[PDB]
Design a protein around this motif. Structure first.
Motif, PDB file in Angstrom:
ATOM      1  N   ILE A 138     -13.723   3.424  10.949  1.00 43.73           N
ATOM      2  CA  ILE A 138     -12.546   4.220  10.678  1.00 43.73           C
ATOM      3  C   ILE A 138     -11.318   3.375  10.427  1.00 43.73           C
ATOM      4  O   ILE A 138     -11.098   2.367  11.084  1.00 43.73           O
ATOM      5  N   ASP A 139     -10.507   3.838   9.477  1.00 47.80           N
ATOM      6  CA  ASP A 139      -9.219   3.239   9.121  1.00 47.80           C
ATOM      7  C   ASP A 139      -8.363   4.341   8.472  1.00 47.80           C
ATOM      8  O   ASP A 139      -8.867   5.422   8.148  1.00 47.80           O
ATOM      9  N   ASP A 140      -7.083   4.068   8.268  1.00 50.54           N
ATOM     10  CA  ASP A 140      -6.217   5.069   7.720  1.00 50.54           C
ATOM     11  C   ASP A 140      -6.416   5.203   6.228  1.00 50.54           C
ATOM     12  O   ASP A 140      -6.477   6.326   5.743  1.00 50.54           O
ATOM     13  N   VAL A 141      -6.532   4.087   5.511  1.00 53.75           N
ATOM     14  CA  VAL A 141      -6.664   4.149   4.056  1.00 53.75           C
ATOM     15  C   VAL A 141      -7.816   3.317   3.511  1.00 53.75           C
ATOM     16  O   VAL A 141      -7.995   2.138   3.891  1.00 53.75           O
ATOM     17  N   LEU A 142      -8.586   3.946   2.605  1.00 57.00           N
ATOM     18  CA  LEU A 142      -9.601   3.258   1.821  1.00 57.00           C
ATOM     19  C   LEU A 142      -9.026   3.021   0.454  1.00 57.00           C
ATOM     20  O   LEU A 142      -8.813   3.961  -0.305  1.00 57.00           O
ATOM     21  N   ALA A 143      -8.777   1.756   0.127  1.00 56.11           N
ATOM     22  CA  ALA A 143      -8.233   1.386  -1.176  1.00 56.11           C
ATOM     23  C   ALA A 143      -9.287   0.663  -2.006  1.00 56.11           C
ATOM     24  O   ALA A 143     -10.113   1.335  -2.646  1.00 56.11           O
ATOM     25  N   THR A 144      -9.279  -0.676  -2.027  1.00 59.46           N
ATOM     26  CA  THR A 144     -10.334  -1.424  -2.727  1.00 59.46           C
ATOM     27  C   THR A 144     -11.674  -1.402  -2.001  1.00 59.46           C
ATOM     28  O   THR A 144     -12.705  -1.561  -2.621  1.00 59.46           O
ATOM     29  N   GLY A 145     -11.658  -1.298  -0.678  1.00 55.05           N
ATOM     30  CA  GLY A 145     -12.886  -1.328   0.092  1.00 55.05           C
ATOM     31  C   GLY A 145     -13.194  -2.652   0.752  1.00 55.05           C
ATOM     32  O   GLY A 145     -14.218  -2.764   1.427  1.00 55.05           O
ATOM     33  N   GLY A 146     -12.321  -3.643   0.576  1.00 53.50           N
ATOM     34  CA  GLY A 146     -12.518  -4.960   1.174  1.00 53.50           C
ATOM     35  C   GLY A 146     -12.619  -4.946   2.694  1.00 53.50           C
ATOM     36  O   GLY A 146     -13.505  -5.568   3.273  1.00 53.50           O
ATOM     37  N   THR A 147     -11.715  -4.199   3.337  1.00 52.62           N
ATOM     38  CA  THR A 147     -11.702  -4.058   4.785  1.00 52.62           C
ATOM     39  C   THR A 147     -12.971  -3.331   5.216  1.00 52.62           C
ATOM     40  O   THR A 147     -13.702  -3.777   6.096  1.00 52.62           O
TER      41      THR A 147
ATOM     42  N   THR B 244      -7.921   8.324   0.762  1.00 49.80           N
ATOM     43  CA  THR B 244      -8.799   7.518  -0.067  1.00 49.80           C
ATOM     44  C   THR B 244      -8.200   7.443  -1.463  1.00 49.80           C
ATOM     45  O   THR B 244      -7.513   8.374  -1.902  1.00 49.80           O
ATOM     46  N   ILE B 245      -8.416   6.328  -2.139  1.00 58.29           N
ATOM     47  CA  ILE B 245      -7.806   6.100  -3.443  1.00 58.29           C
ATOM     48  C   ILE B 245      -8.897   5.956  -4.508  1.00 58.29           C
ATOM     49  O   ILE B 245      -9.345   4.843  -4.764  1.00 58.29           O
ATOM     50  N   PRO B 246      -9.332   7.076  -5.097  1.00 57.54           N
ATOM     51  CA  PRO B 246     -10.436   7.075  -6.056  1.00 57.54           C
ATOM     52  C   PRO B 246     -10.272   6.083  -7.179  1.00 57.54           C
ATOM     53  O   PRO B 246     -11.247   5.468  -7.570  1.00 57.54           O
TER      54      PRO B 246
ATOM     55  N   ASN C 169       3.866  -4.894  -1.381  1.00 56.46           N
ATOM     56  CA  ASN C 169       4.035  -4.736  -2.818  1.00 56.46           C
ATOM     57  C   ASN C 169       2.938  -3.903  -3.498  1.00 56.46           C
ATOM     58  O   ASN C 169       2.182  -4.435  -4.312  1.00 56.46           O
ATOM     59  N   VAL C 170       2.877  -2.613  -3.155  1.00 59.59           N
ATOM     60  CA  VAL C 170       2.040  -1.600  -3.803  1.00 59.59           C
ATOM     61  C   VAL C 170       2.961  -0.449  -4.234  1.00 59.59           C
ATOM     62  O   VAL C 170       4.013  -0.253  -3.631  1.00 59.59           O
ATOM     63  N   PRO C 171       2.610   0.313  -5.271  1.00 59.60           N
ATOM     64  CA  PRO C 171       3.558   1.306  -5.789  1.00 59.60           C
ATOM     65  C   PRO C 171       3.726   2.480  -4.830  1.00 59.60           C
ATOM     66  O   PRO C 171       4.813   3.058  -4.756  1.00 59.60           O
ATOM     67  N   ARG C 172       2.676   2.823  -4.095  1.00 61.31           N
ATOM     68  CA  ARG C 172       2.792   3.886  -3.111  1.00 61.31           C
ATOM     69  C   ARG C 172       2.192   3.445  -1.770  1.00 61.31           C
ATOM     70  O   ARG C 172       0.978   3.339  -1.599  1.00 61.31           O
ATOM     71  N   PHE C 173       3.078   3.133  -0.831  1.00 57.72           N
ATOM     72  CA  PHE C 173       2.653   2.775   0.515  1.00 57.72           C
ATOM     73  C   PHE C 173       2.586   4.047   1.351  1.00 57.72           C
ATOM     74  O   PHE C 173       3.610   4.632   1.658  1.00 57.72           O
ATOM     75  N   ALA C 174       1.374   4.487   1.685  1.00 60.41           N
ATOM     76  CA  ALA C 174       1.157   5.656   2.551  1.00 60.41           C
ATOM     77  C   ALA C 174       1.460   5.343   4.005  1.00 60.41           C
ATOM     78  O   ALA C 174       0.728   4.602   4.658  1.00 60.41           O
ATOM     79  N   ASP C 175       2.526   5.935   4.521  1.00 64.83           N
ATOM     80  CA  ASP C 175       3.024   5.616   5.858  1.00 64.83           C
ATOM     81  C   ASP C 175       2.237   6.395   6.890  1.00 64.83           C
ATOM     82  O   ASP C 175       2.354   7.605   6.949  1.00 64.83           O
TER      83      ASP C 175
ATOM     84  N   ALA D 247      -4.558  -2.446  12.111  1.00 60.32           N
ATOM     85  CA  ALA D 247      -4.072  -1.799  13.308  1.00 60.32           C
ATOM     86  C   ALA D 247      -4.152  -0.278  13.179  1.00 60.32           C
ATOM     87  O   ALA D 247      -4.061   0.435  14.161  1.00 60.32           O
ATOM     88  N   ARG D 248      -4.238   0.236  11.974  1.00 56.93           N
ATOM     89  CA  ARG D 248      -4.032   1.661  11.805  1.00 56.93           C
ATOM     90  C   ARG D 248      -5.255   2.505  12.140  1.00 56.93           C
ATOM     91  O   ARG D 248      -5.142   3.679  12.498  1.00 56.93           O
ATOM     92  N   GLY D 249      -6.423   1.887  12.100  1.00 57.16           N
ATOM     93  CA  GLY D 249      -7.613   2.495  12.638  1.00 57.16           C
ATOM     94  C   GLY D 249      -7.532   2.719  14.125  1.00 57.16           C
ATOM     95  O   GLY D 249      -8.181   3.632  14.657  1.00 57.16           O
TER      96      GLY D 249
HETATM   97  N1  LIG Z   1      -1.480   2.209  -0.471  1.00 60.00           N
HETATM   98  C1  LIG Z   1      -1.561   1.903   0.817  1.00 60.00           C
HETATM   99  N2  LIG Z   1      -0.658   2.428   1.714  1.00 60.00           N
HETATM  100  C2  LIG Z   1      -0.754   2.089   3.053  1.00 60.00           C
HETATM  101  N3  LIG Z   1      -1.755   1.223   3.476  1.00 60.00           N
HETATM  102  C3  LIG Z   1      -2.628   0.689   2.604  1.00 60.00           C
HETATM  103  C4  LIG Z   1      -2.539   1.032   1.263  1.00 60.00           C
HETATM  104  N4  LIG Z   1      -3.524   0.407   0.624  1.00 60.00           N
HETATM  105  C5  LIG Z   1      -4.233  -0.323   1.509  1.00 60.00           C
HETATM  106  N5  LIG Z   1      -3.698  -0.162   2.754  1.00 60.00           N
HETATM  107  C6  LIG Z   1      -4.147  -0.824   3.996  1.00 60.00           C
HETATM  108  O1  LIG Z   1      -5.007  -1.894   3.645  1.00 60.00           O
HETATM  109  C7  LIG Z   1      -6.293  -1.627   4.179  1.00 60.00           C
HETATM  110  C8  LIG Z   1      -7.179  -1.015   3.124  1.00 60.00           C
HETATM  111  O2  LIG Z   1      -7.197  -1.831   1.984  1.00 60.00           O
HETATM  112  P1  LIG Z   1      -8.578  -2.221   1.288  1.00 60.00           P
HETATM  113  O3  LIG Z   1      -9.199  -3.314   2.089  1.00 60.00           O
HETATM  114  O4  LIG Z   1      -8.183  -2.615  -0.117  1.00 60.00           O
HETATM  115  O5  LIG Z   1      -9.538  -0.996   1.233  1.00 60.00           O
HETATM  116  C9  LIG Z   1      -6.185  -0.593   5.288  1.00 60.00           C
HETATM  117  O6  LIG Z   1      -6.271  -1.219   6.557  1.00 60.00           O
HETATM  118  C10 LIG Z   1      -4.852   0.089   5.008  1.00 60.00           C
HETATM  119  O7  LIG Z   1      -4.104   0.237   6.196  1.00 60.00           O
END
Ligand SMILES: Nc1ncnc2c1ncn2[C@@H]1O[C@H](COP(=O)(O)O)[C@@H](O)[C@H]1O
Ligand SMILES: Nc1ncnc2c1ncn2[C@@H]1O[C@H](COP(=O)(O)O)[C@@H](O)[C@H]1O
Lengths: 216, 216
Positions: A144-153, A176-178, A37-43, A80-82
């Protein structure tokens, strides 16, 4: 080459061919066509299914760490995506690829992370682990990971590398999601303990348009 | 080179240097030091943390598919540990790496597998997915994962590739467990529909001894 968009936050310039490949090939999906449940899921498969893009990522990061001094000693990729990106870098550098996983996926004596309390109605932090001794003291670790969103991971990675007595070289993500401000937040969190952690992104999410929408 | 240990079931000869690397470096853990209730949990990180072994796997499989005719058009790797091996092969071959995942991890319009009923007190089959159209008609698909045990995961891959109108080149795993008889079972299942599916293993589990035990 990389440009500073914020303190210790670097982004691949949009004229670079990898940047154009990623802008061209990245696909994202709305909630109805996606698992979250995010508006844009990057595949991430939009990248792994594009041999040209996957190769460009590999070449870019391998050359980066080959000419970096001191060189990284380990790559730590996030489940898993890293896992999709780390091994292909590590195999060229001749260094270990280490796995950050939830405890119930990881084997051996483990170390667990300590996430911050969740924010408003918000998104449950995940406790992540590495095996104790997987990262030695005075290791220099690329995360390394595929997406940096909030930074929690990312922060779980930072906490585990520091708990192991090791150095973080940098945190790399493909996207990355500024707007979510992960680098800025990690850089002031815990009294600025992580101020010197460098974040590298290969593409900004702001650059993706509905031309990137995979929805049927 | 590969030897036939059963009909369409091939295993890397134990004199090969990759075979010796895998025998030397593979680590397994008992239930108390592992995330799953099996007597020997083969830790994939024992392979990804060994640059020599990871590279040997990569070199071996890349040369295999380069000199194979017809060449594979796609690699399909199984969530999550297949993700560790597939991309590094695919990036050298210039072909897509496709993801087999549970539906709630996968994006887009999906296709789900149809596992057989579980056996005695036994181990819940997992429904797996690929994105519809990720594998085109007359694709030739290499399936990959770290371990072939019962063959349930492998069969989900077979069912999804066939449902897409595509051919399976072979199923490759780093480790294979002969005692569980996955190839033999898949080869007689559904009236012998999968009789011609080739299974490749890189190391047999029978070769692992307590010298491979990671337990503290
Ligand atoms: N918008 C997104 N589209 C695809 N994967 C996401 C998205 N946002 C977060 N993720 C996944 O959630 C983790 C990053 O979220 P975060 O911990 O908020 O930085 C990564 O392991 C990503 O694979
Ligand atoms: N003994 C084992 N050690 C580590 N992983 C295993 C083991 N057995 C099965 N697996 C995992 O379970 C899946 C294979 O099981 P199966 O479907 O029975 O062939 C793979 O994705 C493996 O990662």
């Amino acid at each position: 080459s990389l440009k500073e968009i914020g303190p210790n936050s670097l982004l691949l310039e949009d004229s670079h061919s990898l940047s154009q490949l990623l802008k061209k090939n990245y696909r994202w999906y709305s909630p109805i066509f996606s698992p979250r449940n995010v508006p844009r899921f990057a595949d991430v498969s939009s990248i792994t299914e594009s041999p040209e893009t996957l190769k460009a990522i590999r070449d870019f990061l391998v050359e980066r760490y080959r000419t970096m001094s001191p060189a990284p000693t380990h790559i730590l990729g996030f489940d898993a995506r890293g896992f999709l990106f780390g091994p292909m870098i590590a195999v060229e550098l001749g260094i270990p690829f280490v796995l950050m996983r939830k405890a119930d996926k990881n084997a051996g004596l483990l170390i667990r992370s300590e996430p911050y309390e969740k924010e408003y109605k918000e998104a449950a932090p995940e406790v992540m682990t590495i095996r104790h001794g997987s990262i030695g003291k005075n290791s220099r670790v690329v995360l390394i990971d595929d997406v940096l969103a909030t930074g929690g991971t990312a922060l779980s990675g930072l906490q585990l590398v520091e708990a192991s007595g090791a150095e973080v070289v940098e945190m790399v993500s493909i996207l990355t999601i500024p707007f979510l401000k992960a680098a800025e937040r990690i850089h002031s969190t815990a009294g600025g303990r992580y101020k010197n952690v460098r974040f590298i992104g290969l593409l900004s999410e702001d650059v993706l348009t509905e031309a990137n929408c995979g929805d049927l």
